[PDB]
């Protein structure tokens, strides 16, 4: 058998790649920007997913809906989707020109004080404050961590959840039970089976798994996973 796909990940190669990508919707969506159906479909599907999960996301212990946008790029998901649902938003993104553009993209939200902290770091080195988040939203980025590191990240995320907080992963899937390494951006595309293994090892239970509909046929499937900590 081949060495594991995730053994080829090199963080420095990923950051070198993304640092030279245009700080635009086309850049962060790998060419599938506003001239395509993808941004529109993405927001529709994410909004529908969160709407159907409302009964699973009632805040507890006097909390409000503080979210974090992980691997946020230029802030597209916060600008176009998360701000409707969340009381306040933090963002985690390692790439410097993306952070710089994020300040422009999120200007209107900043005027309302809706942006808390922007953490210029890779998710592997980031820790959420304990108990802070109603929602930890991880979209189109977790392939940059190998499996073990992703388990570790998700374990830190659990401690970062409010009571009844939720983790969402919105990510590509391979069509078979074999993961694919992409040398261009130094990341892996995982199977659904691999994601389920990782979620179990992190101590999470799936409460929803939904396919993002309406995307161009040539793309890998995209899935939305909603996750809760396993009860003690």
């Amino acid at each position: 058998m081949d060495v594991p796909a995730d053994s080829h990940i090199k963080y420095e190669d990923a950051i070198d790649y993304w640092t030279d990508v245009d700080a635009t919707v086309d850049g962060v969506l790998g060419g599938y920007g506003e001239g395509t159906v993808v941004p529109t479909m993405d927001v529709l599907g994410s909004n529908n997913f969160l709407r159907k999960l409302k009964s699973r996301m009632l805040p507890q212990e006097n909390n409000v809906k503080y979210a974090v946008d992980i691997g946020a790029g230029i802030g597209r998901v916060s600008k176009t989707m998360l701000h409707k649902h969340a009381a306040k938003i933090d963002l985690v993104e390692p790439v410097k020109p993306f952070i710089e553009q994020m300040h422009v993209e999120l200007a209107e939200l900043k005027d309302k004080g809706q942006i808390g902290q922007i953490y210029e770091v890779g998710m592997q080195d980031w820790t959420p404050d304990a108990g802070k988040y109603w929602l930890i939203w991880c979209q189109w980025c977790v392939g940059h961590l190998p499996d073990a590191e992703l388990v570790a990240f998700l374990k830190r995320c659990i401690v970062g959840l409010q009571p009844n907080g939720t983790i969402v992963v919105k990510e590509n899937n391979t069509p078979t039970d074999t993961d694919d390494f992409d040398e261009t951006d130094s990341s892996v595309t995982r199977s659904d089976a691999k994601f389920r293994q990782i979620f179990e090892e992190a101590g999470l239970k799936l409460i929803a798994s939904e396919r993002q509909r309406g995307l161009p046929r040539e793309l890998y499937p995209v899935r939305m996973y909603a996750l809760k900590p396993m009860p003690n």
Binding site: G30, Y32, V38, W140, L215, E218, Y220, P221
Partner: peptide
């Protein structure tokens, strides 16, 4: 990001 399936 979204990506073309191999």
């Amino acid at each position: 990001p979204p990506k073309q399936q191999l």
